[PDB]
Design a protein around this ligand. Structure first.
Ligand code: BLA
Ligand SMILES: *[C@@H]1O[C@H](CO)[C@@H](O[C@@H]2O[C@H](CO)[C@@H](O)[C@H](O)[C@H]2NC(C)=O)[C@H](O)[C@H]1NC(C)=O
Ligand SMILES: *[C@@H]1O[C@H](CO)[C@@H](O[C@@H]2O[C@H](CO)[C@@H](O)[C@H](O)[C@H]2NC(C)=O)[C@H](O)[C@H]1NC(C)=O
Ligand SMILES: *[C@@H]1O[C@H](CO)[C@@H](O[C@@H]2O[C@H](CO)[C@@H](O)[C@H](O)[C@H]2NC(C)=O)[C@H](O)[C@H]1NC(C)=O
Ligand code: NAG
Ligand code: NAG
Ligand code: NAG
Ligand code: NAG
Ligand code: NAG
Ligand code: NAG
Lengths: 275, 49, 49
């Protein structure tokens, strides 16, 4: 049931600083008040991140991006628009692929043989008689077979209302693929701002290490699409969210651990002579 | 009579990464001519029993 | 599985939920969460100089 959309306004890409963001815990040990120098894959300070947005002026961005050495993904949004990711090497039935999707009731992680659509997306419909927003579309993949790893969580229910205002949620993820392990580090911050990433400091903690054992070179982002009576392949409305992507590089860092065992500051040992 | 239910991969483009699994059954191209998804001369099935 | 020698004495600290061992500046064993009765009792050296 794959559908390829038509209404899309052309727009040049945008680039942004990285500030001091995208640092994670490299070990699970509890250390207190320790200045530790390490060498690992990190996001360089004040690097060049790429900007994509979904606003409605017909902007709906979900291209295929490389996965050279693990990525840093930042999402600024007020409503739940960004729904997940797909990782792979060719994104067709010839090779295995990984899919992480929140379908508003459960979060699903599957490593199968997928046949992905050209423009994968999720959908939400708005009803005026009872003013309800409900999930009504899963136009992601056509077929799935020869699956190896499958995981679904406990059921829940989240809000799908298209609220209007400022971006109240910033979510940061670091994705790595080492020795057959897909490592995901995550962090969440509440904000009240618009149009840009807040400069500051990140404190991403480990989230999951999935033993999937596949080969990953490309990835794509799966968003949500709004449909209502105000509007097929043209009768749709975008939301309001933004996501920034950056690539990790082999660097040397100097991490600082406070008395509570938390990372509070870091120094990138490649930026300026003072560092 | 022979048990033929166990298989192994004979040809690949490059060596595997540690703890990596590959179950694709694409036709391997040994020669310079393209295989076009069919077996023949210098075009072998990657798995054997 | 962590073996050692010393004198056992009650004390207190706090751990993150996915953390069990806590080291020192000298990279020795400071703190450990007891498995049966979930407490945060630690260890002190025995020999006196
Ligand atoms: C896609 C994978 C995905 C992951 C790994 C995930 C993890 C995750 N999301 C949470 C909250 C949440 N998760 C979301 C939503 C999201 N947060 C996201 O990572 C993304 C992409 C959304 C979707 C837009 C929201 C809104 C909450 C807060 C719910 C609450 O506070 O009750 C929590 C805290 C729940 C708890 O501590 O009991 C975890 C661990 N959520 C996900 O949806
Ligand atoms: C809110 O209104 C919508 C629109 O009628 C309801 O969706 C209908 O649900 C029934 C079954 O529950 C279906 O038979 C209809 O086909 C649905 N309508 C459409 C247009 O698809 C929805 O159930 C309502 N939500 C409530 C009452 O909580
Ligand atoms: C979308 O979320 C729903 C949960 O509402 C998932 O539904 C599961 O469906 C299978 C088969 O129909 C059942 O065995 C499960 O019990 C359902 N889960 C529940 C009720 O929590 C559904 O799998 C999700 N979509 C995808 C693609 O995974
Ligand atoms: C993981 O997938 C990538 C993408 O297909 C593989 O890289 C290709 O390898 C072939 C074989 O030599 C080359 O002809 C291509 O030019 C490569 N493409 C790119 C983009 O690098 C890679 O070999 C795979 N990993 C392993 C271990 O086989
Ligand atoms: C877009 O989707 C349509 C219908 O799903 C399909 O026929 C078409 O080939 C797709 N576009 C491309 C470039 O494949
Ligand atoms: C980032 O990349 C773009 C294009 O690759 C380039 O024009 C720009 O100078 C780079 N640096 C910054 C800080 O945007
Ligand atoms: C970083 O600061 C601002 C945006 O935060 C930008 O204009 C400036 O050029 C950046 N400096 C760099 C990339 O050195
Ligand atoms: C992959 O799918 C094909 C088609 O059903 C099947 O013949 C083959 O045995 C499957 N391979 C594995 C490893 O599951
Ligand atoms: C460590 O955590 C405790 C518990 O909330 C808190 O009271 C204390 O302020 C924290 N330490 C620092 C330096 O913030
Ligand atoms: C047995 O295991 C339980 C479960 O954690 C624990 O509370 C208890 O202290 C352990 N020991 C005994 C003697 O029950």
């Amino acid at each position: 049931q794959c559908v390829n959309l038509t209404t899309r306004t052309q727009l040049p890409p945008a680039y942004t600083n990285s500030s001091t963001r995208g640092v994670y815990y490299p070990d699970k040990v509890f250390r207190s008040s320790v200045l530790h120098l390490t060498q690992d894959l990190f996001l360089p300070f004040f690097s060049n991140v790429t900007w994509f947005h979904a606003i409605h002026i017909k902007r709906f961005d979900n291209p295929v991006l490389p996965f050279n050495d693990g990525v840093y993904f930042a999402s600024t949004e007020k409503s739940n628009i960004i729904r997940g990711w797909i990782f792979g090497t060719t994104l067709d039935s010839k090779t295995q692929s990984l899919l992480i999707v929140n379908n508003a009731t459960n979060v699903v992680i599957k490593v199968c043989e997928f046949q992905f659509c050209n423009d994968p997306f999720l959908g939400v419909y708005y009803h005026r008689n009872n003013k309800s927003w409900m999930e009504s579309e899963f136009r992601v993949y056509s077929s799935a077979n020869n699956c190896t790893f499958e995981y679904v969580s406990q059921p829940f229910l989240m809000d799908l209302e298209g609220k209007q205002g400022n971006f109240k949620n910033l979510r940061e993820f670091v994705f790595k693929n080492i020795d057959g392990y897909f490592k995901i580090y995550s962090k969440h911050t509440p904000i009240n701002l618009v149009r840009d990433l807040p400069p500051g400091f990140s404190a991403l903690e480990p989230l999951v290490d999935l033993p999937i054992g596949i080969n990953i070179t490309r990835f794509q982002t799966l968003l949500a699409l709004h449909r209502s009576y105000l509007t097929s392949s043209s009768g749709w409305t975008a939301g309001a969210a933004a996501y920034y992507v950056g690539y990790l590089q082999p660097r040397t860092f100097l991490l600082k651990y406070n008395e509570n065992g938390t990372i509070t500051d870091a120094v990138d040992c490649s930026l300026d002579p003072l560092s | 009579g022979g048990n033929y239910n166990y298989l192994y991969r004979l040809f690949r483009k490059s060596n595997l990464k540690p703890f990596e699994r590959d179950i694709s059954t694409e036709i391997y191209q040994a020669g310079s001519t393209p295989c076009n998804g069919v077996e023949g001369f210098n075009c072998y099935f990657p798995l054997q029993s | 599985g962590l073996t050692g020698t010393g004198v056992l004495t009650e004390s207190n600290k706090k751990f993150l939920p996915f953390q069990q061992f806590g080291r020192d500046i000298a990279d020795t064993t400071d703190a450990v969460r007891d498995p049966q009765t979930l407490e945060i009792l630690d260890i002190t050296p025995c020999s006196f100089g």
